[PDB]
Design a protein around this ligand. Structure first.
Ligand code: FE
Ligand code: FE
Ligand code: FE
Ligand code: FE
Ligand code: FE
Ligand code: FE
Ligand code: FE
Ligand code: FE
Ligand code: FE
Ligand code: FE
Ligand code: FE
Ligand code: FE
Ligand code: FE
Ligand code: FE
Ligand code: FE
Ligand code: FE
Ligand code: FE
Ligand code: FE
Ligand code: FE
Ligand code: FE
Ligand code: FE
Ligand code: FE
Ligand code: FE
Ligand code: FE
Ligand code: FE
Ligand code: FE
Ligand code: FE
Ligand code: FE
Ligand code: FE
Ligand code: FE
Ligand code: FE
Ligand code: FE
Ligand code: FE
Ligand code: FE
Ligand code: FE
Ligand code: FE
Ligand code: NA
Ligand code: NA
Ligand code: NA
Lengths: 154, 154, 154, 154, 154, 154, 154, 154, 154, 154, 154, 154
């Protein structure tokens, strides 16, 4: 099916952002594991797998619309401490949230309602699983202190 | 069965207090969950379900006695921090305890012994599950400090 | 995540309407049970539990958006006979339907597409489970008469 | 254990009333069955078995207190039509309710709290199973007419 | 296998009548469901599935005989009330019965005995499942009145 | 619930197109089976059943909105060879895709968001199951030739 | 039971044709197996077993009618290549189809309706299993070429 | 469905013959049992149950056609010895065979093809189960003598 | 919860009496076992475990009410023969019965209805399990003589 | 453990090549799926998962050695036809094979034998699963032609 | 098989170091258990069992090569506090790592490749299980403080 | 993959030695069985199967490297008595051990690390299963005498 060149281009933009998020979680999860925080490792490993499904859904949708997917992830910027890692992930999902919202309006505008629903599904994940869980972790650090928090994540 | 208009009126008073307690636990449990304290979420969610059964028992008993149940919850006053939430719940159960004790005497006085037994059952719950668990949590905060306490509730 | 103060305010409006619907079904179901109509009791009891999930979803969504949920149910207006109860429930769902439709447009306007999808899910329930089942019951009364209808609900 | 001669005498009074209720349900249930109303047969047969347990509990309690149980049932007065049978059963449980309430006060007065709790248990049954179910059946007849009601009890 | 052009033409006539019956049951069953008569919904839904198998058998038989099936259903004429729907279905099966009988004679005449047996199988269904069940429902309405009948179909 | 006469009219238009698609798949699947291509038979038989669910959902939705469903399928135009059949099905789904997109905009415009979501669900099916599978089959023919392709579908 | 000498004679004619078909499939299936076409072997082996049941049914029916079955198969004429084998089998079933049709008319004429039903059952098999499957195989050869076809039958 | 008065009349004739056959087998089977021939008892008991199904099918078919079934069995004529019983049963099935054949022609003539198929089913039973089994038993007596035969039936 | 200093003091009095009863049963059961009366051993061992639960319930209730439990058992006075042991246990439960009755009145007077219900539960045990079983054993000795009685308890 | 800065740097080089291979297989597998070659999709999807484990092992090993992993994949160069895709994958694994061989010598030289064994494990995979399977597919195309090959991969 | 006297001598050196590590873990694990740190006990107990397998593999390999194993463990130097114990274990594994690396080069030099592979297996364990887990524990102490760390190991 | 002509040539040399070892064990095992030593038969039969896997791994590896495997086994030299057979097998594995060691160095030299790992795996088998088991058997003969040894192998 030949999709709208603007829609395809912006799915591609979203795709390189999802490939990035996948890779940022890949490195963060393994950093968490190396440091001995199994619970952060398991959660970031899970988010890595979800980002991989978000990427997959965009990639297949671009192929269906007869586009050529852009496979280079955006640049990632990993933290070097637990608080910087959480903050770097929160900044990434904030950016992804804003990109998706704009894609959603753009799909409405070109009357690509199926691409729009794909983006809306991913936006719910970004807001309600990923972004909310991150704010939650920063919230715990704020409430019990970093040391107590990190103990709880072993 | 036509019940004593005073008994029915005071069951109704208890009913609007139980509807309130249900709703106060509803909001507190979900606040606890939003902040990442799954264990407080599970316990307040459980107390919400119990308050719903306390309300149900009063409502059905008022209908059996051919009264018209009052379905407006009393005003609730949720906390904004973990210690204020626990304190607001403790103040609510203290009020409920005192209301029940007076209802129990009033049922004895109008010779409604079945309504009395319903209130006595709920009073045991209020004292021995709900009030005692709350004093217990404040007691833990007092003994290990708020940060350690909150860590234990993740 | 900081949501749009107008969106949060209107979710709050919807929330106090869902708390109300929950409570209206609570009293109607138990009235049906007291009168011996087990089948109306079971159905209204079920709708009460669904309204409780509708309320829960709004409440959590308001908390995620960093709003303060309004926990006072709207005023309810229960019937005193089977036909008035059904009519009072139909008028409630008609009002809820119209409120949701307006919320849906408002979320689109502030580009809160995830809140919008939450409201759309609840609107489908309101129209296709709840409103349609009520019109259905009035339709049966109209077709076989109230006495035959009530017999069938024992 | 030697019980208070007044308490024993009044348990005995309650006992001959429970033996009566047992026998009134015995005849009503079998009349219902003979006429083809299996559902009234099953319910009255069940109430007959419950009255037999109420009688048993009083009888054993009188023996424990070193009294001599009075085994003659009170006179019973069965109906000859479905509405008269329901009304005769409702009048019986109303009388039993009032007798129990007075026994409960009398046990409190002689400080026989265990006999009192036995009577309170039976009073809850009389009010909430038996009396409420009967008012319920008359209520159904009133709402759908006797013919529709009787059809539903086949 | 090259079938007789007259046989193929008349199978085609039967086929467009079966496609019609399928569609008339499709709409009637869903109308019954919308009105709350689950038992009429289930029965008409079942007849819809059977008409679909009758259509399928004719279609495949026409293809085997190297004909081109006519896929346009005949015009259908749904009722707007329960009695008109039953009557419209009875008139349809009466027409189908007569068409089949004539097809059966026509197959005998062109010595297509396998097409004949297919039509005879469907005729038994039309007479003994479908037509007989419809006369039966009208018969019940006639015997107990429409209101009682409709109550029994909830 | 009284729906917007324009929305109902256009659901009806979509309904007669879905009834058509159902029937076009009905004939194509059985043609495939007659020729010995079991795998095309199974896939078209499956699409026939899905079109039947698409039709069902529109029909019920029109009834809920108090419309009168139009039950005449649009005209269908079956192929006479495997490549023409695939092309005729692709042209049908292209038309259905465009009709749905316009219905989706029309529902948004009359603020019928539940009808809109029904159409969006079906559009995803049309694009991602049905249209994509057809382009896929033509793509295989183009890549390996018609003879090799048809061999693979036995 | 003494059957009509003409009916018995013609059952006997059909019997020697079924014995023949059995034997033609016997040799074809084993030729297919020798050449490595397991799928043609399995299908012809199956048809051989079915012809054996067709023969059995005629033989027993002739014995019941107090006839003497003729046990010499007609002459068979096996192919020497896959296309000639399929064509030789198609010519055999065409002959059997015509013989059965005439037997069916002859049984009707002597009022032997049970022999007639036996022949009708076998005619349905000849047309709808056997003849249709053969035309189908020739159809596949015509559509994908002999080499591709034979590959698919390994 | 209003059937042809001649068809109904002749189904009725067949029905009184099947009721008779049922009763003749009833008495023969129990005579066989009384004499100690369990195997003849079991077989005649089985034929009695089959005749009861033949009767049932005619009776229901006459009711469907809006006839009044004739429920008086024809006169029966039981044997007094094993060979006379077998012969009396063989004469009965011979008569039934001839009656059915004529009914079958009569149904064809009034174009009642479903009644015809019912009669054809029963004719196959009469010829191939019942008549053939009886000739078989007489055949065994002829081949091994009556004494050996009767020994084998204990 | 701060309980009434008088209620707490008297729970404490009851507690030291229950600790005593536990210990009196402890020694009696093991004396019974040493002498070879397994059945008296098992019953007194069971009563020891029940007294331990009675003690536990008082102790926890005193702690909940912010009292300091008194953990010294009252003085016990074990028998030296089977009849003196039974009599010493009967005198203990008589004393416990009277203490509980007075506690029950005292709780009513300070409006501690939950402590009251705890005492009422234990009073039922004291009267209906423990006291009644003891009178029962003395009753058996009186009826069959001590030797026969003791034989039955091996 | 502080690893040799040269070893870490070259693991990092290998890591960005494995991230690339993962992504090249990601796009190729989904391209294969879009075109209808399920078997190529499943195999490339599998190789994608294996490359992800190769990447994971390098990443964790770099972290253990206190290096900072480089998370940017090398540039990838996907094919646009089945033969170009296979060739692009073969060229990638040839490059990976040569890079690994050099890493293996480099680890030997810095006496990092555990990193060396990690690289040797991956080299066996690259040669014996991945490279050998690709040469194999090109070999099949060469032997049976591209069309036959692609048919076999549906 | 007669091994190289230098290889055997150095396996022996490694063996007395593994016997030592086994014994150092033996004492540390039991010290951890005595202090109440079950999780450190379980982990050190596990490492003790692994060191025992490392020792076993060296011992058997020396015997196979016709050497005489040296069974005296090296001197061990246990800590007296949790941080000194972890540090003493880390210093031991650092020494073992360096000894193994040199043994690996020495086996390569005498062309004993099987002894070399044994040492490489143990080196991977020393680096990736044992050394990495120890650095990990010190890392946790550094991140959350010793008290929080020790709490987590109870 | 094109391997180094020297590596391929020497794998080929190893291959003809493994084919030989397979065949030497083949004859020895069956000689052992013929003489009644089931335990030597089972062990040599097992070594024959292992040599067959060693051969297989070399053969496949040579094919992967685009070499032509040499399939002629080296000359074998079986014993004629149990001690000569064991000695002939020990001399064979000694030769294989030395050949492998040289192949391992040669693979290192041409940077074929995967062939090297294949040879190292087989060398461990040759030394630790095969050579060690043989020395072991000679050792037993030396310790208990040949007669006792052979008895133990029945
Ligand atoms: Fe995402
Ligand atoms: Fe996310
Ligand atoms: Fe998530
Ligand atoms: Fe409560
Ligand atoms: Fe509570
Ligand atoms: Fe509780
Ligand atoms: Fe709702
Ligand atoms: Fe609702
Ligand atoms: Fe619902
Ligand atoms: Fe009672
Ligand atoms: Fe009662
Ligand atoms: Fe009850
Ligand atoms: Fe039909
Ligand atoms: Fe029909
Ligand atoms: Fe049917
Ligand atoms: Fe569709
Ligand atoms: Fe579709
Ligand atoms: Fe689909
Ligand atoms: Fe045949
Ligand atoms: Fe055939
Ligand atoms: Fe067949
Ligand atoms: Fe019969
Ligand atoms: Fe018969
Ligand atoms: Fe039979
Ligand atoms: Fe006690
Ligand atoms: Fe006690
Ligand atoms: Fe007890
Ligand atoms: Fe790789
Ligand atoms: Fe690879
Ligand atoms: Fe692989
Ligand atoms: Fe070690
Ligand atoms: Fe270690
Ligand atoms: Fe380890
Ligand atoms: Fe080997
Ligand atoms: Fe070996
Ligand atoms: Fe081995
Ligand atoms: Na802590
Ligand atoms: Na009725
Ligand atoms: Na092919």
């Amino acid at each position: 099916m030949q999709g709208h060149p603007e829609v395809i281009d912006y799915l591609n933009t979203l795709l390189t952002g999802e490939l990035a998020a996948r890779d940022q979680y890949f490195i963060h999860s393994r950093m968490y594991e190396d440091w001995g925080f199994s619970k952060l490792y398991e959660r970031l490993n899970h988010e890595m797998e979800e980002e991989t499904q978000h990427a997959d859904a965009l990639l297949r949708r671009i192929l269906l619309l007869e586009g050529t997917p852009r496979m280079r992830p955006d640049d990632i910027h990993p933290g070097t401490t637990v608080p910087e890692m959480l903050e770097a992930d929160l900044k990434l999902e904030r950016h992804v949230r804003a990109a998706l919202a704009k894609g959603i309006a753009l799909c409405e505008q070109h009357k690509d309602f199926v691409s729009r629903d794909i983006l809306k599904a991913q936006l719910a994940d970004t807001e309600e699983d990923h972004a909310y869980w991150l704010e939650q972790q920063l919230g715990l650090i704020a409430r019990m202190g970093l040391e107590n928090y990190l103990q709880s994540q072993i």
